């Protein structure tokens, strides 16, 4: 018997209560760093240790935006884990999750960039680079990549559930879900300015609702703000 939820790792672009930073031309700091590390190190580093390298890149970066509150601002990424083994992507086998299927798993990249005005949510310039980054990266890592763009909260919920329920998960070894949008602590916005709670997303993939993925590693990457606080940072003593 299993707990209701296990074997997930969830990477967050920023800390609870704070904004995640995005360059209007290069894309989000977190996705940029994530793909930079994964592309270089997926061959010899497990995913949790790779996210520590990502943390180190984000800790060192600072904002460029002269004349605004984001100039010289800071951000800190984090990850949370219910993994019970090393997660090597194998693009060591005995103490790691089994990860040999072809494809290695299904991946979903869900990007909201153009918003329909209902709330004050702005165009996410650079989100196109983030989207291209993850689609290409996950394909090169051996995943069968599904894509969704500019979805409402209800479309997100319905299509995430459809993705979780796909029969293909029975014959793969892992899963990836990447969500990129505006958001608040614990929830992400659809393009209509309505919220999808992240706990409801994770539940779609848990051991009760998604038996096809029981005991298989499930990766979530969340590029979204978690609040309104801009981190001014601190001087090193």
């Amino acid at each position: 018997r299993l707990p209701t939820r296990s074997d997930m790792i969830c990477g967050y672009a920023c800390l609870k209560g704070t904004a995640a930073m995005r360059n209007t031309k290069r894309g989000s700091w977190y996705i940029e760093a994530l793909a930079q590390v994964f592309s270089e190190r997926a061959c010899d580093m497990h995913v949790a240790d790779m996210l520590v390298k990502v943390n180190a890149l984000i800790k060192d970066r600072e904002g460029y935006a002269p004349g605004t509150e984001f100039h010289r601002c800071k951000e800190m990424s984090e990850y949370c884990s219910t993994l019970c083994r090393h997660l090597y992507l194998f693009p060591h086998f005995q103490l790691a999750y089994r990860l040999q299927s072809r494809p290695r798993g299904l991946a979903l990249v869900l990007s909201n960039v153009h918003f329909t005005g209902e709330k004050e949510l702005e165009f996410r310039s650079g989100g196109d680079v983030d989207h291209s980054t993850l689609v290409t990266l996950f394909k090169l890592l051996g995943y069968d990549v599904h894509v969704l763009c500019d979805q409402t909260a209800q479309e997100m919920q319905e299509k995430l559930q459809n993705f979780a329920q796909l029969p293909a998960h029975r014959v793969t070894d892992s899963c990836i879900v990447a969500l990129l949008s505006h958001g608040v602590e614990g929830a992400i916005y659809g393009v209509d300015g309505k919220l999808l709670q992240l706990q409801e997303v994770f539940q779609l993939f848990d051991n009760a609702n998604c038996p096809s993925l029981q005991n298989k590693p499930k990766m979530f990457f969340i590029q979204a703000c978690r609040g309104d606080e801009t981190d001014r940072g601190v001087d090193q003593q």
Partner: peptide, 5 residues
Amino acid sequence: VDVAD
């Protein structure tokens, strides 16, 4: 430039 998500 850098902006907030």
